[PDB]
Design a binder for this molecule. Structure first.
Ligand SMILES: NS(=O)(=O)c1ccc(Cl)s1
Length: 282
């Protein structure tokens, strides 16, 4: 069923809440035993958001390999994403270790450091060229190289140096800065513009490791980003784009990380972004 028609049918009936709860009811449940170990309690921002053991990213150290991050592997679309929480004060060095080990080209950030008067994630990147950051626990150095500030997003060029080997890489930081404190954007136009800027960078392409995507918990806004990207990709690859079922794509993605898409408004916004995205590159 064409999703544009499904959309109008749900909207006229006002059944967004009932669709969303059907997804929650059918979603996968897998063990998260590593996330719940007592040694990892300060590595988790939220007690009810954990990575599944089967899909978690492992850090390459013998001490403690744990980070709140999951590999989402979409077999038919041929895309991979790492979804993670906003870094904590004691996990900033783990975060950049993961970026290094997984060979990511891009970091996608969908939240502000402060929202609703509370801290949603640590200030994990340098704000001035001449004041670099050193993460002593993971032996990495991070330098701001360039800054391009637009109305809806900022793009930063960063230099990450493995102080052990003195190799350096260029990491692109894509920061979406205008998601509202409550609800979802009214129009998906600026979110779709942002997605096509990430695509054009090469950050989503198979010659790099997976893109690292985060918001505060790494399930809501982060979920919307990878659901829209994957749905638009399959609509271009398939002989019938009307065969793309966004609810089935979301349940496939929820096999790899719990809770992706946090509200019925985020589910409706996802339909909108895909509906408009397709209708712009049509
Ligand atoms: N300073 S620059 O030549 O623009 C530069 C680009 C990429 C880096 Cl990493 S450093």
């Amino acid at each position: 069923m064409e999703m544009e028609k499904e959309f109008e049918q749900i909207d006229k009936s006002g059944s967004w809440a009932a669709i969303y709860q059907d997804i929650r009811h059918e979603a996968s449940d897998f063990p998260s035993r590593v996330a719940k170990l007592p040694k990892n309690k300060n590595r988790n921002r939220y007690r009810d958001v954990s990575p599944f053991d089967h899909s978690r990213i492992k850090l390459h150290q013998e001490d403690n390999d744990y980070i709140n991050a999951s590999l989402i592997k979409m077999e038919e679309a041929q895309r991979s994403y790492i979804l993670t929480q906003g870094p904590l004060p004691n996990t900033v060095g783990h975060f950049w270790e993961m970026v290094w080990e997984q060979k990511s080209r891009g970091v996608v950030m969908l939240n502000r450091v402060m929202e609703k008067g509370s801290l949603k994630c640590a200030q994990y990147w340098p704000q001035k060229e001449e004041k670099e950051m050193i993460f002593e626990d993971t032996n990495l150095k991070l330098t701001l190289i360039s800054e391009d500030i637009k109305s809806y997003y900022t793009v930063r060029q960063l230099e990450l140096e493995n102080l052990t080997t003195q190799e350096t890489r260029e990491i692109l930081h894509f920061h979406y800065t205008t998601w509202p404190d409550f609800g979802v954007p009214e129009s998906p136009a600026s979110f779709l513009n942002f997605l096509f800027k990430v695509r054009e960078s090469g950050s989503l392409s198979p010659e790099h490791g997976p893109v690292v995507v985060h918001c505060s918990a790494g399930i809501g806004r982060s979920g919307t980003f990878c659901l829209a990207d994957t749905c638009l990709l399959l609509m271009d690859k398939r002989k019938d784009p009307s065969s793309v079922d966004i609810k089935k794509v979301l349940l496939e993605m929820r096999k790899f990380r719990m809770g992706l898409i946090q509200t019925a408004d985020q589910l409706r916004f996802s339909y909108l972004a895909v509906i408009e995205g397709a209708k712009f590159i049509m």
